[PDB]
Design a protein around this ligand. Sequence first.
Ligand SMILES: *Cc1cc2c(cc1C)nc1c(=O)[nH]c(=O)nc-1n2C[C@H](O)[C@H](O)[C@H](O)COP(=O)(O)OP(=O)(O)OC[C@H]1O[C@@H](n2cnc3c(N)ncnc32)[C@H](O)[C@@H]1O
Ligand SMILES: *Cc1cc2c(cc1C)nc1c(=O)[nH]c(=O)nc-1n2C[C@H](O)[C@H](O)[C@H](O)COP(=O)(O)OP(=O)(O)OC[C@H]1O[C@@H](n2cnc3c(N)ncnc32)[C@H](O)[C@@H]1O
Ligand SMILES: O=C(/[C]=[C]/C1=[C][C]=[C]C([N+](=O)=O)=[C]1)C1=[C]C(C(F)(F)F)=[C][C]=[C]1
Ligand SMILES: O=C(/[C]=[C]/C1=[C][C]=[C]C([N+](=O)=O)=[C]1)C1=[C]C(C(F)(F)F)=[C][C]=[C]1
Lengths: 495, 500
Amino acid sequence: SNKCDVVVVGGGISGMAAAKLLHDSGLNVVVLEARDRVGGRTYTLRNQKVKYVDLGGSYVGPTQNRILRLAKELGLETYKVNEVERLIHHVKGKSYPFRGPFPPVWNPITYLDHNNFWRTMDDMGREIPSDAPWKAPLAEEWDNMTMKELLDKLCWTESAKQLATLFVNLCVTAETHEVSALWFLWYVKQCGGTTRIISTTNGGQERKFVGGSGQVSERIMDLLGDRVKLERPVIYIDQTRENVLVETLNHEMYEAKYVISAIPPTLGMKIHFNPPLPMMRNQMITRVPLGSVIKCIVYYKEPFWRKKDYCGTMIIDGEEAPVAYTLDDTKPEGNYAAIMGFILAHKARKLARLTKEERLKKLCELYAKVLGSLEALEPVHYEEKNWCEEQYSGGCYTTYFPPGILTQYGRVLRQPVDRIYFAGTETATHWSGYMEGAVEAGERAAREILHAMGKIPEDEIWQSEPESVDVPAQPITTTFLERHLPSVPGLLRLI
Amino acid sequence: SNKCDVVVVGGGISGMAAAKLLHDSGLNVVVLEARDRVGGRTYTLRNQKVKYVDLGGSYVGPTQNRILRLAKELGLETYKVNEVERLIHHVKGKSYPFRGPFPPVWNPITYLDHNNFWRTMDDMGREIPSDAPWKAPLAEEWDNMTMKELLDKLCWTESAKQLATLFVNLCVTAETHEVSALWFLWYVKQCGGTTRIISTTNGGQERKFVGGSGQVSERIMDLLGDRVKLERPVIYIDQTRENVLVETLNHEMYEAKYVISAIPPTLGMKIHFNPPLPMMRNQMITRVPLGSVIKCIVYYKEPFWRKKDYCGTMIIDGEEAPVAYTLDDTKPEGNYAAIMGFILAHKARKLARLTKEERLKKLCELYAKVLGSLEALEPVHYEEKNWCEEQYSGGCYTTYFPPGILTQYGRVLRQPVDRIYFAGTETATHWSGYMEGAVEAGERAAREILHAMGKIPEDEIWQSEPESVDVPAQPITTTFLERHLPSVPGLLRLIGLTTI
Ligand SMILES: *Cc1cc2c(cc1C)nc1c(=O)[nH]c(=O)nc-1n2C[C@H](O)[C@H](O)[C@H](O)COP(=O)(O)OP(=O)(O)OC[C@H]1O[C@@H](n2cnc3c(N)ncnc32)[C@H](O)[C@@H]1O
Ligand SMILES: *Cc1cc2c(cc1C)nc1c(=O)[nH]c(=O)nc-1n2C[C@H](O)[C@H](O)[C@H](O)COP(=O)(O)OP(=O)(O)OC[C@H]1O[C@@H](n2cnc3c(N)ncnc32)[C@H](O)[C@@H]1O
Ligand SMILES: O=C(/[C]=[C]/C1=[C][C]=[C]C([N+](=O)=O)=[C]1)C1=[C]C(C(F)(F)F)=[C][C]=[C]1
Ligand SMILES: O=C(/[C]=[C]/C1=[C][C]=[C]C([N+](=O)=O)=[C]1)C1=[C]C(C(F)(F)F)=[C][C]=[C]1
């Protein structure tokens, strides 16, 4: 057997961040990675046509201080996603350009309904503990409803319900009827609320890494050398003896003091456990699917949309459109002009039966309509990735919780099982679902082990992160009218 | 490698029925079973205090002709569960004895609401094809609602909503808010509807096997001999070469022409696939949990409840009650008197924290109150099994579908993946979730392979089953009033119109 201090299962950002922290503390770590690459739900493809492209997780922004610090230490730089010109909201077959993060509305009833929807998402979130959403005062009530039920109650207009639906589909790559209202409300609040999660400027989509986010995992693999074992899917963990035994599919055995599980929760099902897992974890890992998305990048000769004072952001309502959301993916130098779009949730499943060339035609025709430009019909290149097909991800971006699961099983997610500690972005308390949450959870799991070893005190397990000097956060603000305008039923109670 | 025609993954009733059919057809089969025993979600415990007891699946009944036929061919016999005396419905801390399968209501408005609830479940079921529920005309609308939402729309009384809640909890070991309305309506219709699924006499809970249901899998293992490999959990299936390669945890390799996967769909996640599964199955097997249940059997000196004209059936509403449903589990000889009860859904999670002795105490106190009998506080023995702890089951009785999954992913549940065919009760079209459905699916998967091999024509893949001569099925009937009485909103519309 190969003997080490800690085996880390998974070489995504979380497992690499955990392995780096333990290595830096002087422990002998091994990373066992199922794939022939590191990075997991991050994947940067390089070729002459694109230079580089993120086909998985890409964006970082203010308040994501851990991923920004880790990347800076590994030598990476960010650049800003283009948001100089106007965003577009495409509604009932017409483009409405706008500025500011929230698509505006002009009808006064629709205005009250939209304002109340976003305000209510944040009001509900203020009662949900980031580190324990099952402790929300209405946890059971909210966990026993889907987001479809909540939007049916809250939205008096079809306009608000359609945009709220798009919000859920885009944020969590899942239908409103698939997901728990408590879990969705927690998910938004633990990113800093509605404005922060939906924003490019001053929010989650502000920046990308120069050369791709895959460099985070690749550069930690560079540091660790042959401590990273590629094509070593873990099949078996045995905790019955003095040392933990970890077996891989290619017949290798690893012996360690402790294990970090840095894989999506449900992919724990791919490991046979001795002794069996405790009942609550045994069932939990069958109840926590990942969402569905195709990330598609269409390349053009120039960023032609900018000539029409459009930044390349499109928010596209309705069933017919394959893509509900796009961002400008042009490189910081103005070259490799491109539009990134997502095919979300049921559409990822519906449109997966098409060929790559058929998806490209649908996207170009959509973009030609929304940007009002024939130039959209002349792509020079195309790259896409359907994350639903990945055996060792299960989907993207993250794990969602169907109704009833977070209150019954949520407490299990980061509970250690003897000498197995749990990392992965699903176990974070701030930007869970993101690269930021991956770093938080991997470093916290590593520090749980250092505490178990008697190397650090209990109060050092959870550590605050200084604000980035390069990407400072501006405050989220609201107006008097936003805070105090009535809801639609509120306007009716006054009549 | 060990070479054969067909590797069957899983030695539950479904894999064992598949293996038996293939063996009987002259093929070389191997069964790879993870556990040190066959039977899976069936498990018959034998000891001197109980003689035998089913801690997993137990009951069979009219219309379950495949399991009856298989068991009969293996030399097994059935007996009837005791339903001679009155059933009890316990609600708001009082017991109401009754006869007939449905707990009755006297309040006229409540009666309309109850009648309409059961009628509507079956009316909706008649829109849903057993072999393709996603083809129901309103499949998307019904799949995008939980059963909680459906009961909130349908039940105009708390009485009906509370009974309907217990019905879902007991039938599918899940909460109403956990499960798709389309899936639940399918599940009930593919068992023959509300009356058949809830009934003891003339329904699913009519009979048990003398000596236990585990004998089905055990007697097939006896016929197959050393073809059944115990403690062989499958970890890897490789279809990249001319023969399929199947690898076990204990480092054995099996080579076959075809594979039958006879495990619960989500337990396919325990296998690494080369090439990877197609996208739809890859995601489906992360979306289909099994329910939660502890099956608990309390033994007594005598079946004392019969002396009070109670058969031992208790239908118990109330968050405080650990157990929502019981049956008499006395042996057919009248000895080893016992009450079987289920701890369902969230209660199986909440009460798993307790010791075995603490659960026995809570159950005895409950039974004493419901039966009005101090004798219930004098148990002589106790057996239980929490199925939520089983690595190689995932839960019991069966797999449930949360909202949105059956329409998006249901088409791939029994779609072959190259040379992998899918059995297991979850893939059945009649009594899916039951031992009957295990037999249907195992035999159908085996015939798909016989067809692939050119041994049988396509029209022999799906085969009807002659009715049991031992267990005749009475038809499900309704009265004129049951068919035509209005719902509560129907009555309100009649009132509004009159007064006009
Ligand atoms: C896919 C995706 C993700 C995504 C996104 C868009 C798409 C299409 N957009 C994002 C964004 O713009 N910004 C952001 O911060 N995140 C975004 N995301 C999500 C992000 O990619 C993920 O949150 C993060 O990458 C998750 O990291 P984590 O380290 O927690 O998880 P992982 O990447 O899935 O890594 C797990 C690794 O484990 C290996 N594995 C799996 N099973 C085994 C076994 N049995 N044995 C050994 N290794 C195993 C996987 O192969 C993987 O490398
Ligand atoms: C648990 C339970 C079930 C049950 C019930 C009450 C309880 C508490 N009441 C029932 C009843 O009264 N009447 C009835 O007809 N059914 C009832 N059920 C359901 C019933 O037990 C199940 O429907 C039926 O037994 C399912 O049979 P099936 O053959 O489809 O599935 P299985 O029994 O789960 O068998 C699967 C086997 O596969 C092995 N396994 C799992 N993973 C692997 C791997 N990787 N490799 C090899 N073998 C594997 C399992 O160990 C099992 O033996
Ligand atoms: O929820 C939103 C965006 C999330 C989001 C989450 C993860 C990853 C990414 N990304 O990679 O792009 C975007 C949103 C929503 C809206 C709105 F208002 F239309 F609903 C307008 C803009 C953005
Ligand atoms: O749905 C019911 C019972 C299913 C059921 C399904 C599987 C296995 C078993 N079992 O082993 O006991 C019982 C039911 C429901 C009622 C009612 F009406 F109260 F809801 C009254 C009696 C029975």
